[PDB]
Amino acid sequence: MVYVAVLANIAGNFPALTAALEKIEELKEEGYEIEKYYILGNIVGLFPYPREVIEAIKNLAKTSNVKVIRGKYDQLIAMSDPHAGDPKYIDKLEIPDHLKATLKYTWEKLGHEGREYLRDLPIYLVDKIGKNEIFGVYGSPVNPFDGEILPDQPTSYYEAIMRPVKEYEMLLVASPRYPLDAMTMYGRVVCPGSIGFPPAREHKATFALVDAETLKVKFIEVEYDKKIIEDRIKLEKLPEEVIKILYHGGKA
Amino acid sequence: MVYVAVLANIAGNFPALTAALEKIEELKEEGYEIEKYYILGNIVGLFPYPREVIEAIKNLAKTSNVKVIRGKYDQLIAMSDPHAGDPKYIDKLEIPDHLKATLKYTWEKLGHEGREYLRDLPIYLVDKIGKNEIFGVYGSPVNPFDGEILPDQPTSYYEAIMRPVKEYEMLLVASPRYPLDAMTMYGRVVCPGSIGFPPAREHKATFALVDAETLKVKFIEVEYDKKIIEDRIKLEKLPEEVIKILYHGGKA
Ligand code: NA
Ligand code: NA
């Protein structure tokens, strides 16, 4: 049958992304036919593989239908003056010291072409899975980049969030960080989980496959190598906090 | 020919809305074919005619194709607990004093049925005006409710704002509060003007008619009676500050 692959929060973690894409190639040998991909942010920003992540997405988009939308971290980079000489503007932003470091590094490594790529990324996902209209945004409908839809809340919580977008059958968001599939009277609120941004310990690249016909959601978890990411963080001189996030999780 | 009427920022000003609608009816008698209406927020919130504004729209929706989206003020009311006994939460919001007064007034005057109506209002407008896809939001694509797009800026300013929504031919926003029609390489950024929220002195109910085939924008200005609004403000014991905004304009 046919499913739509939904991924989110790669956050510059190339190994996690590669593991996920390879699992998908394998599932296609298992009866899954994947007509298109939805990739929610953050795309880059935390882990040291910004260029490899974008290249992998660009390559996928050439042979498959890929719709990508930017996340908070992507926007913090894209919003900078196009010909800024450095990422110093970041030191004034109200964000943790560790994020300031990774964002600066990302800004630099991306170069002008990488930064322009982020600037071309849409903010909103408006498409249909099957014959069903769906809407997608990084944070929440009320606030695209700073809004946070929490996982583990009662149906009433999700019902109120879905109301403003009740014309859509499904709302796709990245902020919950964990697999979420909440049916409400106004439609379903869904989070595919997190690809490369660990929410806690023993993180596994997580994403979702949604049935284009029935809209049912299946969540997939795939292991990836954290040691090579740890080594890269060290080699690149990034904050120890980034390693702590890798193994114990952290919030956006 | 055929046009789509675009209105924004009624802000509870029934007399202004009535004047605009009546002008539309006159233009129809003059050969203007109106296919549908787009009514961007703020619907209610500042002036004392919340119930009458909603009733006028509802009746319009009965006979014509009308799509409405909420604005900042509408959201501040809709976000409240469905069974709160008063609008006291508003006093703790970081908004000017006069707005607390008018929002609380609006909250109670709306009644449960009125507030529920705002809660059903979509946040985003996604439609086609002919073969042209369009997107609409109150503030800005980056921040739906708090985002502000300025008028009278260089093309480069609007270009950067259109880029994240470049999949659409036209972006409709209310925040500029003045007629705006800026063409960029990524599409046009348009503001129909303000229907009932004066940005300055001698304000006239302003809206736009968009050519359903050429996407050409025509702005219309209509006069309405401010004295009856002033009198209503006084009768309802609302801030003198609202009368000030009425004749000298005020900011959202
Ligand atoms: Na729905
Ligand atoms: Na465009």
**Which domains does chain B show, CATH number per domain?**
1-252 (3.60.21.10)
- The whole-angstrom separation of Cα B150 and Cα A189 is 34
Residues of A in contact with B141 (CB under 8 A): 123-124
For residue A141, which residues of chain B lie inside 8 Å, CB to CB?
123-124, 144
Other Cβ atoms closer than 10 A to B127: 16
Cβ distance of A167 and B122 shorter than 8 Å: yes
The token duo for B22 is: 């009546």
Token pair recorded at residue B105: 């007034």
For residues B115 and B108, give the distance between their C-alpha atoms in angstroms, rounded to a whole number: 9
The tokens 């109910």 sit on which residue?
A: B205
* Helical ranges in B64-146 per DSSP H: 72-78, 97-119
Q: Tokens in use for A115? A: 């930064």
Closest Cα partner for B71 from B11, B111, B17, B112?
Answer: B11
Q: Tokens 């209209």 appear where?
A: A133
Neighbours of B147 (CB within 10 A): 18
A167 CA to centre of ligand 1 in angstroms: 5
* Distance separating alpha carbons of residues A19 and B116, to the nearest angstrom: 46
Closest-CA residue of chain B to A71? B142
Our CA-based measurement puts residue A208 at a distance from the nearest CA of chain B, in whole angstroms, of 25
User: What tokens appear for A59 in the block?
Assistant: 């390559």
Which among A40, A120, A101, A124 has a CA at the least distance from the CA of B163?
A: A120
Residues that place a CB less than 5 A from ion ligand 2? B 166, 186-187
The order of strands in the sheet holding B33-40 is B66-68, B33-40, B2-8, B205-211, B217-222
**What is the spatial distance between Cα B110 and Cα A235, in angstroms, rounded to a whole number?**
61
Q: Enter the tokens of residue A206.
A: 């997580």
Q: Do A165 and B120 touch (CB under 8 A)?
A: no
Which residues are bridge partners to B40 per DSSP? B8
Identify the DSSP state of A12: T
Q: Report how far residue B180's alpha carbon sits from residue B184's, in angstroms, rounded to the nearest whole number.
A: 13
Helices (H), chain A: 14-27, 50-63, 72-78, 97-120, 155-162, 227-235, 240-248
| Amino acid identity at A126 | V
Q: Report the gap between the CA of B50 and the closest CA in chain A (Å).
A: 20
Q: Which helix (H) or strand (E) holds B5?
A: strand B2-8
Torsion on CA atoms A161, A162, A163, A165, rounded to nearest 10:
120
CA of A113 to the centre of ligand 1 (A): 39
A136 alpha carbon – ligand 1 mean position (Å): 13
CA distance B21 to chain A (A): 26
Cα A118 from Cα B167, distance rounded (Å): 15
Q: In whole angstroms, how far apart are CA A207 and each of A40, A47, A121?
A: 10, 18, 20
Alpha-carbon gap, residue B36 to B128, rounded angstroms: 11
Cα gap B36→A34, rounded to integer Å: 38
Whether B84 has its CB under 8 Å from any CB of chain A: the answer is no
Are A164 and B123 in contact (CB < 8 Å)? Answer: yes
Residue A16 neighbours by CB under 8 Å, 6+ apart: A10, A195, A196, A205, A224
Amino acid at A147: G
What count of other Cβ atoms lies within 10 Å of the Cβ of residue A134?
24
CA A116 vs. chain centroid, Å, equals 18
* Nearest to A41, CA basis, from A139, A134, A120, A131: A139
Buried b (16+ CB within 10 A) or exposed e, A201-239: eebbbbbbbbbbeebebebbebebebeebeebbeeeebb
Give chain A positions within 8 Å (CB) of B143.
143-145
d(CA A243, CA B167) in angstroms, rounded, equals: 38
B151-162 core/surface letters (b: 16 or more CB in 10 A; e: else): beeeeeebbbbb
Rg (CA), chain A: 17
- Please say whether the beta carbons of A44 and A9 come within 8 A: no
Cβ contacts of B205 within 8 Å, gap of 6 or more: B16, B17, B19, B20, B23, B195, B196, B221, B222, B223, B224
Nearest to B162 by CA among B192, B132, B142, B138: B142
Beta-sheet strand order (sheet of A33-40):
A65-68, A33-40, A2-8, A205-211, A217-222
Burial B29-46 (b: 16+ CB within 10 A, else e): eeebebebbbbbbbbbbb
- Strand A179-184: give its sheet, edge to edge: A125-129, A132-137, A170-173, A187-192, A179-184
User: How many alpha carbons lie under 13 Å from residue B97 in its C-beta half-sphere?
Assistant: 4
Half-sphere exposure of A183 (CA within 13 A, CB side): 3
Q: Count the neighbouring beta carbons within 10 Å of the beta carbon of residue B250.
A: 19
Question: Which residues does A76 contact at the CB level (< 8 Å), separation at least 6?
Answer: A45, A90, A93, A95, A103
Residue with tokens 């503001």: B191
Q: What gap in Å lies between CA B177 and CA B155, rounded to an integer?
A: 18
Residue ranges of B 11-70 with Cβ closer than 8 A to chain A: 70
For the record, the structure tokens of A127 come out as 């498409």
For residue A114, give Cα distances in angstroms to A17, A43, A49. Answer: 18, 12, 12
Residue found under tokens 């009676």: B225
Which 112-151 residues of chain A touch chain B by CB within 8 A?
A: 119-124, 126, 135, 141-145
Cα separation of A217 and A22, whole Å?
20
The answer to whether the beta carbons of residues A184 and A154 sit under 8 Å apart is: no
Phi, psi (degrees; rounded to nearest 5) at A75: -70, -35
Helix (H, G, I), strand (E, B), or coil: what is residue A38?
strand
Residue among B70, B143, B166 whose CB faces A143 most closely: B143
Q: What is the DSSP code string of B55-66?
A: HHHHHHHHHS-E
Query: Which of B122, B145, B165 is opposite residue A123, by nearest beta carbon?
Result: B165
Cα(B191)–Cα(B161) distance, integer angstroms: 13
Q: Which of A118, A249, A244, A106 is nearest to A177 (CA)?
A: A249
For residue B172, what are the β-bridge partners?
B136, B190
Residue A122 Cα, gap to closest chain B Cα (Å): 5
Query: Under an 8 A CB cutoff, do A123 and B142 touch?
Result: yes
